[PDB]
Design a protein around this ligand. Structure first.
Ligand SMILES: C[S@@+](CC[C@H](N)C(=O)[O-])C[C@H]1O[C@@H](n2cnc3c(N)ncnc32)[C@H](O)[C@@H]1O
Ligand code: SF4
Ligand SMILES: [Mg+2]
Ligand SMILES: [Mg+2]
Lengths: 402, 164, 126
RNA sequence: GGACCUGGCGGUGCUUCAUAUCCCUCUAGAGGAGCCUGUUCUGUAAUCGAUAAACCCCGAUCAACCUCACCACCUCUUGCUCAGCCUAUAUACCGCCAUCUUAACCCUGAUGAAGGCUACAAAGUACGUUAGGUCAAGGUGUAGCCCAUGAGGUGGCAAGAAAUGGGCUACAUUUUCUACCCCAGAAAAUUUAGC
């Protein structure tokens, strides 16, 4: 509960309210509709001139829905509890058949040359928008940050590399991109060279590797994993990767997944793993804290039954099936080295803001670790804070103190 | 120091625009532990001036840079490795000077300062040469430098400069 | 124990696909509503939906096969095919109950024509 | 360490052809005017925000001198009826739509790994899932505010500029108007599909 009617007041630092309107309040983090770079948009279409007919529309849709509805692989432990429960009810072959149903069949996707094109036509634009929104968080609240180095685990189509260039292009000097699939690496380099096998890379310093380097000595300023931890075959694999990524993180670790229950639970495992440091004597002894979106390091209050996701509207790459703008629903967590900058953390709006006559509905994750459904009105809370919430939107911060 | 990663053989092949692993016509030492061993056998390079020949990918260059040298002069014949060496130089400000040219014709007597010139009868003059060159180029080079030692000129204007 | 370790007969009607409804399969419900000029096809459809639900809920595990809902004027003949597992007295009790309840629900003289079979009559296997 | 067996070659090149998809080939348009929109930037205290709820009554339509929404100011409240709000919730249920998951035998090799064909013939035969959408032709509950999320009043608000995406109109001589429904008289470059 970070909203007490009549007690909580807006936080006026930098002499905000006097010096600026309410529509530009510092908790505003909304990003206008994302347009991809023309070089990327042109390159993607050129690579698809061979086959972009009616079959491709069906293929792109099938892949998009399949990836969206994927569940995390069922760990064995979950499997025996389901097995015994069905066993007691029946009282082995019958149980297994009843276990093939009511359980999710998780399969590896071998990203070959064919399925790599379908992925690029389905997730390049969507993935780019989600990562751009995540990076906007780091820029907006810390505009002095000028990273010189970046690593991207699970670099399928290079969306992270392009998004990082659009924000920190004047200071980044190295883009390490890791991806086990040869075809995806082949596709990602074509996209940097204007969609042709021969050309000059549009971004300088991109390094492509097939295996994740494992060494605490080499440490990157921004480590990014976007829509990649969901492709790992088990929780042990996710545990090992996230530990390595954190060990090689210099300032910020940006993890982004789908805005589903499977995605959100995945990131809360990684969030707890980094926060609950287990290494006895790490090379980098600095602690970790959640830079965004959580205003606390306490357990997620929405992880029980609900999820936590955010939305970013973007303009899809022109195709035979992309006409109207789309929305990218994603889950994110950003983990930063060091300690929180100050004690004046602000609630996060984690759900669409509903504007109604003279009152506004905001669902806030508060610094104390609890969600608060606040209906803000001018009479109860005040003219200033009501106007701040009137202009706020999904994924913004609410500047409230005491 | 934060130096860029050593290029891999695939990156080397693409950089040389060969598109294959058979038309390379060259061998590289892409193991930093062996290059560390070589630079260790080269002696104590603390605040020393090193003349490197035939770097290529730059494993020897990185190993020398990790040693606390004062200034590393690097002469490379192939232009295609110069961007990588320039990234290396950007990583280490002021410790790397890249020159394009042939080691068989490059003039080293002018490269370094005249204050490093010590008498012949004294100890070696804090200037070292290190090299992993093609075997078709090291024999002419050593013959040329043996002549220079006989004349106490060229790289040996500074004194009894040591070579590895 | 681990995911890698974890990872049919048909009747005549079940066997046939929909595109045989006028070639090999027939029609279960029969009424004049859908004909050109005739009215209340939607009402007859709703009647059939409720009636099938209620027959399947009143004779659980007894119906070997789908019903046949025939209509002559007011008359509503439910020609169902059932099994011989449940006792005959319960068949009679249920028949009386269902006829009376459906007659008072549709306000028409509903009737039942059960046909018991020793077991489901298989046509083939799919 | 010697000999042998099955291999896989996530294989690599050339030779020939089948060589349809895609090429060439054929038809047709798709630039330009005028207005309405999607997105961006700028600006405001504010919403070029909406009419099972207004102008508009040739087509359409914009702001209407309407009401709701917004901004700045104010007033009342035990009020209406143990008042009132459409305020949230299908991220509560149901319904409805949609996503995803759910062989045997016989021979050969000395009875080794192993192998088995010739036609004028030589061992071969047989339901769950979803921070899903929908509160417009549908329901059952659950929460909120009640000196205000209720009821009123006084003023204001009715944007500006591009680059690109889409859409609507007229665009003619093989045409147009009258009579007829065809023998009359007067006018004046890329692409995109398609067989
Ligand atoms: C779903 S794509 C991520 C897309 C990318 N982040 C983007 O924004 O476009 C995941 C990639 O990770 C790779 N991958 C899967 N398992 C991996 C592993 N164990 N180690 C390294 N890469 C892996 C796959 O080859 C695949 O290309
Ligand atoms: S912002 Fe709040 S609800 Fe979302 S993941 Fe963080 S703690 Fe959970
Ligand atoms: Mg829902
Ligand atoms: Mg208005």
């Amino acid at each position: 509960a970070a909203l007490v009617p009549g007690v909580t007041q807006v936080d006026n630092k930098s002499g905000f309210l006097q010096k600026r309107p309410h529509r530009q309040h510092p908790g505003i983090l909304k990003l206008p509709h994302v347009r991809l770079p023309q070089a990327l948009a042109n390159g993607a279409q050129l690579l698809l001139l061979g086959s972009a007919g009616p079959t491709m529309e069906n293929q792109v849709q099938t892949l998009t829905s399949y990836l969206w509805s994927r569940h995390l692989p069922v760990e064995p432990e979950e499997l025996q509890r389901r097995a015994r429960h069905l066993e007691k009810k029946f009282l082995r072959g019958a149980v297994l058949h009843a276990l093939r149903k009511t359980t999710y069949h998780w399969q590896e996707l071998s990203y070959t040359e064919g399925l790599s094109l379908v992925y690029m036509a389905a997730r390049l634009d969507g993935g780019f928008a989600a990562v751009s929104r995540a990076f906007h968080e780091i820029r907006a609240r810390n505009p002095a940050f000028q990273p010189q180095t970046l690593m991207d685990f699970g670099s399928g189509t290079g969306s992270v590399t392009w998004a990082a260039h659009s924000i920190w292009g004047q200071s980044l000097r190295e883009y390490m991109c890791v991806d086990r699939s040869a075809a995806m690496l082949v596709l990602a380099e074509k996209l940097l060279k204007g969609g042709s096998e021969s050309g000059e890379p549009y971004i300088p310093g991109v390094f492509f590797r097939q295996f994740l380097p494992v060494s605490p000595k080499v440490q990157f300023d921004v480590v990014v994993s976007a829509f990649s931890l969901s492709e790992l075959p088990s929780k042990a694999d996710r545990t090992e990767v996230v530990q390595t990524l954190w060990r090689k993180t210099g300032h910020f670790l940006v993890l982004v997944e789908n805005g589903t229950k499977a995605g959100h639970s995945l990131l809360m495992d990684a969030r707890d793993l980094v926060l609950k440091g287990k290494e006895k004597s790490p090379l980098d002894p600095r602690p970790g804290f959640v830079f965004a979106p959580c205003p606390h390091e306490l357990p997620c209050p929405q992880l029980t039954n609900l999820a936590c996701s955010f939305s970013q509207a973007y303009h899809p790459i022109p195709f035979s099936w992309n006409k109207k703008p789309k929305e990218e629903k994603f889950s994110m967590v950003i983990l930063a080295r060091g300690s929180p900058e100050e004690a004046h953390r602000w609630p996060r709006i984690t759900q669409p803001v509903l504007k109604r006559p003279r009152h506004v509905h905001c669902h806030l994750c508060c610094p104390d670790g609890h969600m608060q459904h606040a209906v803000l009105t001018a009479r109860r809370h005040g003219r200033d804070l009501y106007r701040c919430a009137r202009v706020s939107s999904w994924g913004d911060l609410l500047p409230v103190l005491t | 120091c934060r130096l860029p990663p050593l290029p891999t053989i695939r990156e080397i092949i693409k950089l040389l625009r060969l598109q294959a692993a058979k038309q390379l016509s060259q061998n590289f030492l892409l193991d930093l532990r062996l290059t560390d061993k070589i630079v260790r056998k080269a002696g104590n390079l603390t605040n020393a001036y090193v003349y490197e020949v035939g770097p290529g990918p730059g494993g020897i260059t990185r190993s020398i840079l990790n040693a606390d040298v004062a200034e590393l002069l690097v002469v490379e014949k192939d232009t295609r490795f110069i961007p990588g060496l320039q990234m290396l130089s950007d990583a280490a400000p002021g410790k790397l000077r890249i020159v394009h040219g042939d080691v068989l014709t490059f003039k080293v007597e002018k490269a370094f300062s005249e204050s490093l010139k010590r008498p012949w009868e004294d100890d070696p003059p804090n200037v070292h040469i290190i090299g992993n060159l093609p075997f078709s180029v090291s024999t002419p080079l050593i013959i040329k430098w043996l002549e220079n030692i006989s004349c106490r000129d060229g790289p040996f204007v500074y004194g009894r400069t040591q070579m590895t | 124990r681990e995911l890698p370790c974890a990872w049919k007969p048909v009747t005549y009607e079940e066997a046939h696909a929909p595109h045989y409804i006028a070639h090999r399969k027939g029609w279960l419900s029969l009424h004049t509503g859908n004909l050109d000029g005739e009215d209340h096809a939607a009402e007859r459809t709703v009647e059939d939906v409720f009636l099938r639900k209620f027959m399947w809920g009143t004779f659980p595990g007894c119906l070997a096969d789908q019903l046949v809902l025939k209509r002559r004027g007011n008359q509503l003949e439910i020609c169902a095919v059932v099994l011989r597992q449940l006792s005959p007295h319960k068949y009679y009790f249920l028949v009386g109950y269902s006829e009376t309840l459906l007659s008072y629900f549709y306000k028409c003289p509903v009737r039942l024509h059960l046909q018991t079979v020793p077991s489901k009559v298989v046509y083939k296997y799919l």
